[PDB]
Amino acid sequence: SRGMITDRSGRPLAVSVPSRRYYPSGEVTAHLIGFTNVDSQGIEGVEKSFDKWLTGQGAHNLALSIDERLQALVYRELNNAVAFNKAESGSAVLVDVNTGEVLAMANSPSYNPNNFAGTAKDTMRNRAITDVFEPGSTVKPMVVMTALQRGIVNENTVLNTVPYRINGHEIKDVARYSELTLTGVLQKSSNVGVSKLALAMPSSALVDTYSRFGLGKATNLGLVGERSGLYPQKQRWSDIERATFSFGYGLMVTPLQLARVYATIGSYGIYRPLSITKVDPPVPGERVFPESLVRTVVHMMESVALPGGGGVKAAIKGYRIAIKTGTAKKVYINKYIAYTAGVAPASHPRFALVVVINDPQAGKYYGGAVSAPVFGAIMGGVLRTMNIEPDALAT
Amino acid sequence: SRGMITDRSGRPLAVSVPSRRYYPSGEVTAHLIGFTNVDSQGIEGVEKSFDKWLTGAAHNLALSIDERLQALVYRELNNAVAFNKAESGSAVLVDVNTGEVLAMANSPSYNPNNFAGTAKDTMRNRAITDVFEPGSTVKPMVVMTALQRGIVNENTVLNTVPYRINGHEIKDVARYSELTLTGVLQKSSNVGVSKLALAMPSSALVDTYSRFGLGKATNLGLVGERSGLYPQKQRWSDIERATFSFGYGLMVTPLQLARVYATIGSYGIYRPLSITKVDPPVPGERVFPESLVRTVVHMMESVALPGGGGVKAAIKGYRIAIKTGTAKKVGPDGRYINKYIAYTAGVAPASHPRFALVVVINDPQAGKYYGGAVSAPVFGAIMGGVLRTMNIEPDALAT
Ligand SMILES: *C(=O)[C@@H](NC(=O)/C(=N\OC1(C(=O)O)CC1)c1csc(N)n1)C(C)(C)NOS(=O)(=O)O
Ligand SMILES: *C(=O)[C@@H](NC(=O)/C(=N\OC1(C(=O)O)CC1)c1csc(N)n1)C(C)(C)NOS(=O)(=O)O
CATH class of the missing domain: 3.90.1310.10 (Penicillin-binding protein 2a (Domain 2))
Structure with a gap:
């Protein structure tokens, strides 16, 4: 019964x-x-x-809120990417940006609950709500939003991006660019650009923005082991600390927390509580950040998935996508967290997806290399299954 | 490259x-x-x-595989093996008209994207390397043979009272003093099929089983493909002749059993199996009279209807013609042991079969082991998924 x-x-x-x-x-x-x-x-x-x-009793x-069709295609891509990459694990979370509903929540490795007696304990625990990793470059869209809001930069500002040091600490990018547009900062994932952006705002600036997008806050699904991460409550922030914060150092997030960040981007600044139960809409949520400003950075994020940007392997024929890749050293060791987070379709976002692949060991580890293909495979399947009409105009 | x-x-x-x-x-x-x-x-x-x-x-x-069918077959089979705490399971789905293998799945499986140190015994394709005694799944061929030879007619009533021959007891799961020929399959009466077999030469059933492909290579070219164990005896004891009619004394792969049922589904047309997409017309060769197989396929529908051992395979809206099976496993010392193979084999839809399916669950250990309790629900869930996915018009007629 x-x-x-x-x-x-x-x-x-x-x-x-x-x-x-x-x-x-x-x-x-x-x-x-x-x-x-x-x-x-x-x-x-x-x-x-x-x-x-x-x-x-009740x-x-x-x-x-799960759609089994979406759960299955998420798991299929995620589980086989974790195998193919000889990774320790992977997590994928898909959220409806209008409702806050978790449409899919998958991890690899998994186990068969129809006969779990022999399964390794650590395999049983969910990683999308218990694993905490430093979010890396997935925070840079929030950096750009902050700097714009505070008027320290303008939509087309060109930033000098030559490397430099804070007190001996070298701030460098994957590739050396003298200057970059604001769009280019996100497109090339320029630690320099974001770090210079942060250094012209109080230490509180990014700390406010990240919290407004739910970082450091409970996800409140009520699941056992659910975890809130670590979030910095430092009274005084060091220059190195102030700079590394602009690209994901010094805080730790669950995959679910990241998915909620991108659902708030997807809604153009409306923070909505997550739900695992089917939701009857509308859900009002909170306007945590001006719509016009988020709208602008979403468009800048499309460049990450276009030629020249680091997440081009996530591209989906027919659809605009606004994504951000990340790569984070695990705690420091030569082992990595491969990230791709994004919303689609970028013209009017319906879905927020995060793909997190933990310790890929198949020779490749960069987010754009390891999890961006998986993002494109999953989100392409979601868009088709949900009968979303294409977004990209022929050119 | x-x-x-x-x-x-x-x-x-x-x-x-x-x-x-x-x-x-x-x-x-x-x-x-x-x-x-x-x-x-x-x-x-x-x-x-x-x-x-x-x-x-x-x-x-x-x-020839349809990945949509492969996925739903594996889904049901793999979760059934887990749920039943079984050693393993195999499922094979064959296109009745072409011989194409539309799905071929086993559990446990492994991930070929990282086959690190999965046991050798998890990585072999049990659908073609496991051989088990087919048990009661052979019984449709017994009836077919008996009809052809005129020892029974379509409405013969058989005395199915329990009897012992040469010291060996021949007995049904439930006792029934008599059964129609349809009843013999519906209740899977060892007693009834044994009396049909004993009224025919030993070569009779040997020939029929072979014409449906038992003891014959499956010919897919796959590494480790097996052909089974099939009697080449000249001389048969009375007890051997009887137990052969409920599937003792030979060992088949799941793939071989699927070809049998594909041959049943086509109404007696034997077709080579294929794992490559075929250009559709595959004529095959007639091995048994169409009317006789048609007659037994209709009889087999009783197995999935109230009173039949495979009622748990029923699919709303579709007629199905199935046979359940339960066989004692042969242990490592060459004698039977307290472990079982749970079978369900069949074709659908029964009005015009398109698909042959076999579900084989090896050593279920969660309290049930009979084919009708273990494999039959799996057959139903899979085949219902197949019929819907392939847009087969419902054949069930409201009553
Ligand atoms: C964005 O994620 C940014 N990542 C980093 O700076 C971090 N690690 O990069 C190193 C690597 O070899 O991968 C260590 C150099 C990082 C931030 S927080 C943490 N625990 N580790 C870069 C690498 C600029 N872009 O990542 S990307 O996927 O956008 O290409
Ligand atoms: C048909 O499969 C028939 N099965 C048997 O006679 C066999 N074993 O039956 C026993 C059992 O496990 O219940 C041992 C008593 C058999 C044939 S060949 C082989 N190796 N073992 C019945 C009993 C009718 N199966 O029940 S059914 O409803 O699944 O058909």
């Missing part, structure tokens, strides 16, 4: 069979759904967080 | 990327497709079988 867990259209994701739980999508949705005791008590995932409701089924 | 392997509609299943081999369906199609070594040479599955073709131009290769 246990409540049946379904996706947002009623597709069964956990069901009692005459009694035993059966999970029809098995390892595709294992971390989110969780599993139960022999007492049919929930001990992981939604099975645990909604156990009282599942027991009927018909008592549960329709998640 | 290396051709692409695709499904029958061009979906990529093995692709070279700048280079390295990548498998977009990963573990879903692992056993069939196989993998390459470091120097991009195939060493398992299609990658090896077609290695020369794939690497003069490097040609792409369109399998």
